[PDB]
Design a protein around this ligand. Structure first.
Ligand SMILES: Nc1ncnc2c1ncn2[C@@H]1O[C@H](CSCC[C@H](N)C(=O)O)[C@@H](O)[C@H]1O
Ligand SMILES: Nc1ncnc2c1ncn2[C@@H]1O[C@H](CSCC[C@H](N)C(=O)O)[C@@H](O)[C@H]1O
Lengths: 428, 431
């Protein structure tokens, strides 16, 4: 009904793409027709179809849009795979709007993201093809009007994928299958504190964010690597700041989304997306925040460039991260770094990248002493609540938290692992 | 409970005290736990913050630089004597006076207008024998309520106590002049019938949609300030059509109480409203993608100050679009002068608007004389009334029907003499 809905899809199509035709599959005919109306600036060559059935008829759709067209097949792998084969063969840019509020699995978005992200098939050339994720965003009308936070727009470009060598076939898959499995996330959340996957939980995050200075209601913040959402939720609730959180782990964000849908707050919105892929509007954010994420991101220069452009002039960036100290690296620490796929920088390198990007008023701080305190407290909290922890988790999970925390304390003593703080400003 | 609530009051206190010192804050909050959140929130300004749980304890307070009421009037709103007693105490004691009051459960779904009027016109004598009262900064919505509960009727009234010069004028503020003269509730209803549902401007929904498309391509989540938002049709249209977040302001509490009632019914947190003067509210610099004003600024005398404030509030590269009643270049008729004076319009011609825009620093300045379209619309609207008189007479009085027919005929006459024009202005803040 509301034209804002299909116009949101047009906005993403513009981001990822000229276009000679748009094919829309929408069981709801009235809604389908709003896409014809909305897409005129791009092209008037927009046709609506009532059914997936009619999908195999279609060919050569520069843009292919599904509007609540999958509700009957979501829980069926076989039918989903059939859909994916057709969609990939037929579409250039593929948009899937699907309302998941009524799914029995309140984290269905992660299952769908995974299925769509890893699907591969051979085209007529015997080439390896699939869908390349741009983002999974929330329908803004739904967030702001109905307070339905589980209505999604999946945005993909069909492409030929170069051959891969690992057991996981995308970085998204690597995150969700390795460090940020659902069990992994649950264990971490117990260790760090409710809603957090970062040192010291709520109270530590609040201390850190207050370093931005004086917040004003309605200012905007981008949170890079927002995890299960505790930081985003905290800044909205404490300061009335509107947070756009992004994360490439669908397992992490599916939990954040579930919790937002339960405890509604339209100051917060989330995107399943890579920080180096999503295209933010220039000069749009008052703040960019990243809490213990960017050790995961190799191309720090590109990241810092994208942050600089997205900030308003005078806007501030605050990043905390795992980094490296200046001690000679132990073989044990190198093994950890490789298994986590961390790309660690020291504070001199961070300062240099910030200078080269254009940031001013740079402040860096080595918070490793505080990290040591927190690690000791967290390990102690687990070691003194074994009964409770053992009632929710396995011995294997208890052991990996105790030993991993002990490992990190060791890495600190060798000055291998540091906890680094970076705060800077886009010039006025 | 949520600290964002008392922090919103701190934000306004900072605006209205914006140089001066604050030595103490007195909070009256029947809910003790919420009251305590004001102590926590106000520390950056002062730690000298005390919480009281009753208006009963109000008379005992003295010299409160900032005086805050948190849902303290809920039980007494319907008794004007109790409200008057409250106002006498608050005005005597307080410097900056903040009233947070949730009106969602009021039987009067436009209670905000009744309270704004009462608070705005209240006068009493201070110890020096001066005439005193409360000077409106704004009536804003509690943002936590808009975004979390979708309660759009939870308000923060912000005032400064001051001495007012004596006056015997029938309306003692401009806010009162709007609400008692052109924009009475009956006046608003008649205009809405004439212009179209949700609009108090030429041509209703379809004309507004044509005009806003002149901004170019909107992107979802961009922000717009709407100056003189009226009963809200334009703001609601922009949000629904384009996903743009609109902050609408209007000095008529009658107009905005309708907009607010309608937003509360048909919830949309992309829209928020403030009862405030466009020349008083302090917007953050460099914050808006767009500033829009639809057939409002003929009411505002100080166009230079207005344009300066718009310029500062826009982001670099942001756009301003204003339609307005203006004057043409014909010799003014006596009838037109009488109309202009009774309406208290301050009309500029298009050359004057362009000159002020350029002097302010705007770039890509465009102006257009839309008087021929205005003539078309006036004829259509008058025709619609004249061809549907039975419908109109079943809903309104003969006097109201005559008022619209003769008023529209008058404006068509003013156009033919080139007295009244309909002027368009579009410009950009430079990068
Ligand atoms: N390139 C990338 N883009 C977006 N998110 C990323 C990313 N690389 C890693 N992340 C995310 O960074 C997060 C680090 S865990 C910290 C989560 C959160 N900031 C908190 O304080 O609790 C993970 O959820 C991970 O999936
Ligand atoms: N100084 C001022 N500040 C804010 N609003 C003002 C004002 N002077 C006049 N107004 C408001 O300007 C409005 C003009 S009527 C037009 C309303 C709306 N823009 C629409 O298109 O329907 C009135 O509601 C009036 O109260």
């Amino acid at each position: 009904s509301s034209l804002s809905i299909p116009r949101q899809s047009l906005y993403y199509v513009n981001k990822v793409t000229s276009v000679s035709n748009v094919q829309v599959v929408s069981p709801c005919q009235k809604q389908g027709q709003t896409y014809v109306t909305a897409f005129t600036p791009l092209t008037s060559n927009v046709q609506v179809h009532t059914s997936l059935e009619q999908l195999s008829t279609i060919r050569n759709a520069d843009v292919l849009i599904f509007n609540n067209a999958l509700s009957q097949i979501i829980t069926n792998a076989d039918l989903l795979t059939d859909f994916l084969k057709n969609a990939t063969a037929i579409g250039g840019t593929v948009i899937i709007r699907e309302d998941l509020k009524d799914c029995s699995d309140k984290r269905q978005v992660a299952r769908l993201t995974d299925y769509f992200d890893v699907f591969r098939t051979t085209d007529s050339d015997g080439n390896n093809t699939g869908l390349d994720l741009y983002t999974v965003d929330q329908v803004e009308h739904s967030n702001y009007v109905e307070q339905n936070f589980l209505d999604f727009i999946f945005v993909f470009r069909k492409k030929v994928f170069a051959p891969t060598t690992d057991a996981t076939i995308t970085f998204r898959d690597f995150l969700d299958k390795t460090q940020y499995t659902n069990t992994g996330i649950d264990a971490y959340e117990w260790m760090f504190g409710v809603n957090f996957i970062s040192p010291g939980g709520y109270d530590e995050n609040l201390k850190i964010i207050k370093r931005f200075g004086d917040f004003k209601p309605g200012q905007t913040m981008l949170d890079i690597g927002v995890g299960i959402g505790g930081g985003a939720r905290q800044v909205a609730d404490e300061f009335g700041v509107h947070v756009h959180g992004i994360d490439l782990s669908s397992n992490m964000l599916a939990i954040a989304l579930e919790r937002l849908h339960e405890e509604k707050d339209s100051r917060v919105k989330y995107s399943i997306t890579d920080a180096l892929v999503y295209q933010f509007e220039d000069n749009s954010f008052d703040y960019v925040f990243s809490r213990d994420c960017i050790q995961h991101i190799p191309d720090t220069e590109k990241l810092f460039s994208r942050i600089y452009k997205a900030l308003k002039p005078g806007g501030k960036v605050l990043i905390t991260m795992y980094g490296k100290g200046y001690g000679e690296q132990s073989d044990k620490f190198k093994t950890y770094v490789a298994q986590r796929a961390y790309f660690l920088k020291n504070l001199k390198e961070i300062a240099d990248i910030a200078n080269k990007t254009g940031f001013v008023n740079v402040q860096t701080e080595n918070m490793t002493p505080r990290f040591k305190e927190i690690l000791l407290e967290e390990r102690g909290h687990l070691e003194q609540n074994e009964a409770e922890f053992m009632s929710k988790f396995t011995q294997r999970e208890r052991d990996s938290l105790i030993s991993g925390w002990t490992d990190k304390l060791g890495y600190i003593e060798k000055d291998n692992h540091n906890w680094n703080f970076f705060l800077a400003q886009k010039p006025f």
